[model samples]
Target chain A: NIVALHVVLYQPEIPANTGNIARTCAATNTTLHLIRPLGFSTDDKMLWEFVNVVYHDSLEELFEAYKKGKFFFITKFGQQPHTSFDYTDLDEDYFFVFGRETSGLPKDLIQNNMDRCLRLPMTEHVRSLNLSNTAAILVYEALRQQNYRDLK
Target chain B: NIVALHVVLYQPEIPANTGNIARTCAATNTTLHLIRPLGFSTFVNVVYHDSLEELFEAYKKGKFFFITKFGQQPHTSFDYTDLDEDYFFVFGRETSGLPKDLIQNNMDRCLRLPMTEHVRSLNLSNTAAILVYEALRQQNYRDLK
Candidate 1:
């Protein structure tokens, strides 16, 4: 069975990070959603070739479009570690939301969605995990839990 | 309950990726080991600004674990909980993985990250971060408040 995973990057700044994430998305068959304004240009032919890119004016609009899908917001201030959540036996569509490079998701958004907020466990010395790395970890973990469905 | 973890890069070609991995090591207090023949100059210091050297000096104590695709088992198969304060993970160049002879000799010690055959492997820094974090997770995030 094939599963649908959506990776939402809110105001990503670095082109290379996006490129790496695009490669990851292509490999995992996950859809990429970019919430503008992006720090890098989307004209890079190499990036577009790897994965499907969708644009949204705001995260609200993106959420509205995928209303029925399960949403897990990645944030440093999240109450629980990402591994704490049970991603097994869920619906086909699951959305994993990540914040920008410099600053994370908006305060109001994280506060409002506190219940669904999740964080990757790391030392206080580092501000956060690399954006692309974080995305890959969570995406792969979800896939692993699902026995890497639809992937050879 | 802190478990020592080290990441080794063998003949890394990209400077930015190594710099990023160094930053990650600093953040996690994980030591980084770079084998000879690096693609770029570590003196350029674009990302960490000499902080990498400082980190190595500060931590001082850790073991090395070599990362390879042809390991006896997946990275997850290892019981990180059994490791001591010093553990190292070695990764190969961007194009080719660890030296086959080295991996062959240390077959019992080499480890590979699990991934689908569809993708060759993950980005270097990404792979490093994943392995480092996995070790930390197994150790219950010691020394990380």
Candidate 2:
């Protein structure tokens, strides 16, 4: 009766990274939303077996359904630590949006939703992480806050 | 000296995953320790040890917390508040995980992240980042902005 969380990968370009994120989503009972032009097949059986995944034709299409404030974008451009956000609600949906591998979320998208952006803490030395790793780290922080709900 | 935390990967097998971790360590200023036969070229604030034994020998004074599924408590349950402490977060192979004997011997030092019973564990690099950030979050992410 609850949707744990929503993870959005916008025009993702890596199969392995997306595949890896499936495991985390499945484990945490989070729903995975992929904006189309994915790098790999959507005919994912192993992924579908355990994960509650959905697809969107475009970010614009997703925006029509999901409200603002509930949506947060994950990017290097974000001004706050991912931790600064509160995600304690299990009954309501929370969205964690990400971007492609080489490039990231469009500058305008971030610029428009400056308050909804969040970043993991890292130095300028590299200032990045694997796509799935970033998703998992941020997702788990929310889980940690929720006391993991029914999760063990 | 603004030395950050340390991450040790015991016999990591995926080059892309290990390589991905290197970027994370680089980003966080965390020192990465690879117990060799590495999956990729030497990288990061990187250090190499020929074996887990050799790694133990090198960082003998360091505290090691093995990340595994068998941990009695969640990774967040541990206290890593002492910024001055030399804490090491050790991870095992992708498939087999840490040697059975090592896990049993260090059961008290093992930690795990919370997840559903349906899945065994999260991806290696993801698990590593999750634990690393917990410690980082604990110490207020020292000197990190």
Candidate 3:
């Protein structure tokens, strides 16, 4: 009953936020996907620090594990987009996707599969929930809806 | 019907967390009671910042309007060392819980709640939600029974 999550970060900028998101994903047993042209290398010191805290081994080890494991990439959008389906409607193995901080998923990518581009609701003035916080909300909601049965 | 909450402060150290909690309380229509000797002042200069922007104002206005119109304290205390079983229990400032002085002064004012020290202090918002939900749950449970 383990819930598998695929995190897709398209060309993000902030290191701390990315690290925070990574740590959160690891803690929740979710797989994180970083779509490249990233601001920092996966081996960036801060990212490594977070990885060290969460896992015993190096970033290389974590990345390798992610590759070997059942993780999904955003490039697979043609198959699954946020709006294309309702979360509750999703079958057990759902892969939650997100876009880059500065700019969201490329227009073509989103338009091609516009339905699946989901964003967390927030107060109007507040631009958006911090990326990591937003991810936490979705991941938790998915977990909660699943009745946390996966935790066991 | 408006839900009533009993807000208590332990030895809370961090001002920002308390400030954030207070701000949130104000937003959620929750009555905030600070069992004094707090870590930070509620003065404009200290607690009023972008993060707290407009929130404290809304809290103050709401409390003023609601308390006066409804004839409530906006915030209130039961008898010193006195507590009612029906009320919701709220703890303040994450790091420092209710101080020994306040706990001693109002020994009966609070409920004896147990928590695991092994776990980090529950974040303030989460803690508040726990208490509020517990109260709401209890009421619903009793109603159903």
Candidate 4:
């Protein structure tokens, strides 16, 4: 079967985080995607140039282009928090998307998908969880809802 | 200021898990402890321990909770909000896991995260995060924004 779940890291930068995230995905049979600039400049000019030269004017353009699963964006701006979404449709693949380490997802993307966003419960002492930790939490929670999909 | 939490890794052997586990501590302003012969390095807010006994000895005044398969209670079963509580979560090595004696000796305090019977257990770092946040959640995420 195609991977049960997909983890999309939108322009994730940290090697260590991506490594750990990749490991968790491997353990659970979840597919991983590091959306560019996975290796390009994090600068504004380069970003604008990259976006213009790429598939659409913005990567979110491509984000909407892919349409094989139920998509959910993990963001602080979301309405509902953890475990709010139902992932019991084991036959349906789920895609949980995350933003960059430094800046996070584009405003338009988050603004548009507020209804499709999911957030973790946390206090203000921290901005958010470590990227890898967040991925693990969300992925496992999804799997947990599905009875772990035969993972041993 | 008192540490929000204390994360103790006993005889940990994997550098990547520790690294990710350490990141969780920093993200939440918790203190980290390494009972060494360590399989890893390069950490923050780290407190070193020569042995598990040394760690238990140093934190004599705190509450110790061992994460093990033998735990009689799930990690959330404890009362994290009880007055004047010191919470220390001790995670064992990735392979061998926490020693048998500690679980045997501290049966009442050990905690486990419930999972499917399929996998032996969740990954170490994920287990740590799950417990840490559960504690913080029970405490109303004190001192957090």
Candidate 5:
């Protein structure tokens, strides 16, 4: 009864944000993937309890493994808004890749997937929305577009 | 060309959450309204750069929309496009939502955010961000490039 959505965090720098995102994922019945070089210890009880953390070495490895799934990168420099994409297909898999709290996705990496990159709208004053918050918004939007299938 | 969107937090208990929401408000050019009896001191630098009174006075005129679990329609159900520039979204406290009387009085204007039954409710700041961004999206993300 869960959507095949995978939330990927690329070198996240904050354990609290990861914990929060893990909670959101549990609530939504989605899977979470974390790349190496995390900020805090993975031994944190919150992360182990609620989240299924799939470790990945590099983006290339992830892409190779889930070649059939669609990948959407979250970046401030994205040309398209997050809502602009359609995730109406309930049967397909979706991978939302987010970057570290400080620097965001690597420029070259995002550039390579420019067509698949998306951004949330905000004024120039603030750098970006919290990682957990952004992930929740996109996950909910996907679920909503799918008529909230398999979810209460 | 941003729409006059405002977010009202009713007796919010967490200062960190409020601080995050305040940052979101500043980024979007939207106004934030905090209905008093807050958990932490307003003097906290993370909360506001200016006095709370100044922020309140700045956005004295706007329509109020109360957000609760018992609302009639989902947030997406409402045609935000139809709303004018002056719109305010009211959120309840962390532990308990808006007071019963308040929601009852404004039953017609109450809005609900859709979520699975697994979770009690979304985080305060996340909810605020979601609603505010939805409004901004409806308005073509005015003033944000």
Candidate 6:
């Protein structure tokens, strides 16, 4: 019963980033995966402000809806690494992975699944993409490749 | 004299954001603007190193072509409080969007365009698309109505 999968961030840094990612996910109907140790708590004003400003009242409903739907958090190991995860042949259970802001998932966790190591291409000075932006790109790419399965 | 107004950026910061905007620009033939500063320059190397290389390469070239301002970088000494010219406006990253001077000086300056508050100005590519599409809307309508 998997139409989409979300790559949860263990801990995100900025509220604006999370708000942006949430908007992208809600727009695309993809689940968001947020793990523990976030840079700020959910009650942070900036995060709420962003949600109110951009997402409006729908953010709460969407977050509740996502929770009700299929969502996973990478608390323990064994979850597949994104690199080895084959997007081309994704089954009904399509998945999206996300990383933390300052530090990514522990290398050992990801290294074990080298084949599943997928990442957006970037230059040297550029460390990583804005968290929400990365999530938007990966999910949309999947959606684009999938021919918008949900689209009429 | 408008065969195609290709808007291009150098080294963009956010990859997904850029991709997202480019997709919008592609939907219309207005040509997405890009002005690679440093981030985009680095993205070239990461190509295929982790993700699909050829696909991105094709995307890079097809979306935009490079331009050389050389000396006198267009809207250098001008003010950002007006928009008179009719050219596709291109921008860089948030940290740097083609320097206020260049934007002000160009005859086709676009910064002075009105916008909503909050959000450090729409992401670079999104801003370009919004302006280009508006320009296209006006031009196309004039052609018809």
* Best candidate (score: TM-score): 2
Q: Order of candidates by TM-score, top first?
A: 2, 5, 1, 4, 3, 6
lDDT by residue (tens digit), candidate 6, A11-125: 5687766766665555455555565556776777655222222121332343464554332222113233222233444444454445566676656656655544464432233
Judge the docking of candidate 2 as incorrect, acceptable, medium or high.
medium
Query: Which predicted model would earn the best lDDT?
Result: 2
Docking level of model 3: incorrect
Q: Clashing residue pairs, candidate 2? A: none
In order of appearance, the predictions have TM-scores of: 0.84, 0.93, 0.46, 0.67, 0.86, 0.43
Question: Which residue pairs of candidate 5 clash?
Answer: none
Rank ordering of all candidates by lDDT, starting from the highest: 2, 5, 1, 4, 6, 3
Model 1, range B51-93, lDDT digits (tens) per residue? Answer: 3334346557744466777875656656665555567677889
lDDT of 2 by residue, B1-145 (tens): 4534789999899887788888888877789998888766652678888898988887778888989988888889877766456788999999889989999999999888888887988888898888888888887777777
lDDT of 4 by residue, A70-101 (tens): 88988888877657788777577788988888
DockQ score for model 1, please? 0.35
- What DockQ, on C-alphas, does every prediction get? 0.35, 0.77, 0.07, 0.23, 0.42, 0.04
Q: In angstroms, how far off is B6's CA in candidate 4?
A: 2.7
Residue A134 shift from truth in candidate 5, angstroms: 1.5
lDDT of 5 at B90: 79
Stretches of candidate 1 exceeding 4 Å from the true structure: A45-50, A90-92, A150-152, B43-65, B83-85
The runs of at least 3 residues in candidate 6 whose Cα sits more than 4 Å from the true structure, single-residue gaps closed, are: A48-91, B1-145
Q: lDDT (0-100) at residue B116 of candidate 3?
A: 20
In model 3, the runs with Cα more than 4 Å from the true position are A48-92, A150-152, B1-145
Model 1 interface CAPRI class? acceptable
* TM-score of candidate 1 on Cα atoms, chains taken together: 0.84
